[PDB]
Amino acid sequence: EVLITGLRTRAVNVPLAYPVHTAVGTVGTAPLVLIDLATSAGVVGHSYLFAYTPVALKSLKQLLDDMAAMIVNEPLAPVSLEAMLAKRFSLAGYTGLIRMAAAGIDMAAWDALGKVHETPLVKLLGANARPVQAYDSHSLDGVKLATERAVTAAELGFRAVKTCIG
Amino acid sequence: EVLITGLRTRAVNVPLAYPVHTAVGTVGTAPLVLIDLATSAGVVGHSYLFAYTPVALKSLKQLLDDMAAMIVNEPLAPVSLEAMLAKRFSLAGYTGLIRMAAAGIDMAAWDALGKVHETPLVKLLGANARPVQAYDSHSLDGVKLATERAVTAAELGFRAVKTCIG
Ligand SMILES: O=C(O)C(O)(c1ccccc1)c1ccccc1
Numbered sequence: 001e002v003l004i005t006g007l008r009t010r011a012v013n014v015p016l017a018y019p020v021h022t023a024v025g026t027v028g029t030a031p032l033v034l035i036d037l038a039t040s041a042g043v044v045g046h047s048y049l050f051a052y053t054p055v056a057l058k059s060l061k062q063l064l065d066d067m068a069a070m071i072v073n074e075p076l077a078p079v080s081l082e083a084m085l086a087k088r089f090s091l092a093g094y095t096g097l098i099r100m101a102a103a104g105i106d107m108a109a110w111d112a113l114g115k116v117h118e119t120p121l122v123k124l125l126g127a128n129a130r131p132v133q134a135y136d137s138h139s140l141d142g143v144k145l146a147t148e149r150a151v152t153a154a155e156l157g158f159r160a161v162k163t164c165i166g
Numbered sequence: 167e168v169l170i171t172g173l174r175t176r177a178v179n180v181p182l183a184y185p186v187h188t189a190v191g192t193v194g195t196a197p198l199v200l201i202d203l204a205t206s207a208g209v210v211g212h213s214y215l216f217a218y219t220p221v222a223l224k225s226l227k228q229l230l231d232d233m234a235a236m237i238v239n240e241p242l243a244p245v246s247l248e249a250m251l252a253k254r255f256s257l258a259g260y261t262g263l264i265r266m267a268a269a270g271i272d273m274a275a276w277d278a279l280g281k282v283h284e285t286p287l288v289k290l291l292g293a294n295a296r297p298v299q300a301y302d303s304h305s306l307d308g309v310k311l312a313t314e315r316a317v318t319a320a321e322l323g324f325r326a327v328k329t330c331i332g
């Protein structure tokens with residue numbers, strides 16, 4: 001009864017507050033695809049995908065745009081949409097980029113469904129909101145920068161940090 | 167035969183490449199008295215004093231200026247000048263600021279004596295120049311800054327560092 005009426009995507013390369021240092025060098029931006037799922041209820045679901053490397057970014061955006069044809073005019077019923085996408089991609093391989101694109105749809109559909117019911121997603125799933133302990137994630141930073149980032153995270157109130165080693 | 171013919175002093179508060187962090191706060195400048203010891207040979211000996219706190223700076227400069235009267239026109243013979251200053255200040259107390267001022271004179275007189283003989287001080291003292299291992303001195307810096315300063319010192323080629331604790 002609530003139907004999906006549109007899918008818009010936007011590919012962006014966005015600045016990171018913490019540049020990610022790697023064995024190769026430092027990456028300052030993240031490739032994302034921002035998703036807007038329009039509905040017959042007027043509300044729009046929002047989600048996004050992380051493409052990991054700019055090499056995959058346009059391909060992932062293109063895939064989602066082409067997958068729009070499968071979902072526009074279907075009811076906003078994420079579980080049912082997921083089953084349909086799983087079946088449609090059973091030959092191509094329901095994994096990798098295809099699976100990630102299907103997940104972006106699913107996340108936007110549940111955000112829309114929360115909006116249809118004017119309730120936070122956690123409550124729609126049947127649970128109460130509760131605070132959840134968070135760790136601050138850093139990178140392959142070496143001694144100087146790992147110490148600096150760890151001090152900042154502790155000052156912010158985090159009780160754990162993650163560093164990349166190797 | 168070479169005589170001291172003048173003493174000039176200059177009080178300065180100079181910027182430190184490494185601000186000194188203390189339990190109280192950070193000190194960005196050092197109080198110095200710069201010394202010029204003029205001679206009948208034309209060469210000028212240079213030395214300086216560290217006054218430790220700006221509270222002592224003008225007093226130390228004033229003391230040296232008044233001590234000029236004891237040394238101008240005396241032969242440039244640091245060992246003999248030292249004996250004379252030790253005797254003249256035997257009642258006042260040949261220690262503390264008085265002793266530091268006498269040392270500034272002595273250091274400038276030996277620099278002048280090196281110049282009279284056109285030879286590096288080390289050779290005048292009868293030794294060969296040799297490289298001497300140096301450690302880089304830091305302060306009460308905490309974890310972030312001590313790590314940062316230690317990395318820099320190692321990159322510069324130092325094989326040791328000193329940190330302030332307490
Ligand atoms: O666990 C992570 O967040 C991640 O594996 C990662 C992987 C891929 C994208 C974003 C985060 C990681 C974190 C810190 C250092 C290296 C890797």
Ligand SMILES: O=C(O)C(O)(c1ccccc1)c1ccccc1
Nearest residue numbers: 218303304305306328329330331
């Ligand atoms: O040994 C030093 O250089 C000194 O004692 C000092 C004392 C007074 C003036 C300059 C240096 C020190 C160094 C690092 C931290 C605290 C103290």
